């Protein structure tokens, strides 16, 4: 109603939230009925999760942990225990 062009879906200080697949389905269905797409934000840890999130109503998926540690992220690389981690 305020005029949003898209919605970020995801929550889960500890006693308030919602399981993410249900949240995506419900919010995406309502928003789509009103012509608004949705972004799945949270709990996407592999390609199967992303596929499911898109299939049940999300138009696009937000990548956090899944892309953390790639070369293009902020931070400097360092060697520790022969592993090449990033901070």
Work out whether 46 is an interface residue with a second copy (CB under 8 A). Answer: yes
Decide: 17 and 49 in contact? Cβ < 8 Å.
Answer: no
Work out whether 32 is an interface residue with a second copy (CB under 8 A). Answer: no
Work out whether 85 is an interface residue with a second copy (CB under 8 A). Answer: no
Of 3 and 82, the one with the shorter C-beta distance to a second copy is 82
Count of residues binding a second copy (CB under 8 A)?
Answer: 26
Work out whether 3 is an interface residue with a second copy (CB under 8 A). Answer: no
41 annotated as a binding-site residue = yes
Long-range contacts of 38-41 (CB under 8 A, 24+ apart): 38/6, 38/7, 38/8, 38/9, 39/6, 39/7, 39/8, 39/9, 40/9, 40/10, 41/8, 41/9, 41/10
CB of 56 to a second copy, least distance (A): 11
Q: Which residues are annotated as a binding site?
A: 10-12, 41-43, 64-65
């Amino acid at each position: 109603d305020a005029g949003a062009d898209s919605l970020r879906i995801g929550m889960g200080v500890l006693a308030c939230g919602r399981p993410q697949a249900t949240a995506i389905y419900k919010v995406a269905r309502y928003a789509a009925s009103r012509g608004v797409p949705c972004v799945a934000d949270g709990g996407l840890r592999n390609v199967g999760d992303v596929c499911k999130a898109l299939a049940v109503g999300a138009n696009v998926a937000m990548l956090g942990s899944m892309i953390a540690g790639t070369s293009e992220t902020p931070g400097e690389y360092f060697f520790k225990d022969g592993m090449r981690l990033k901070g």
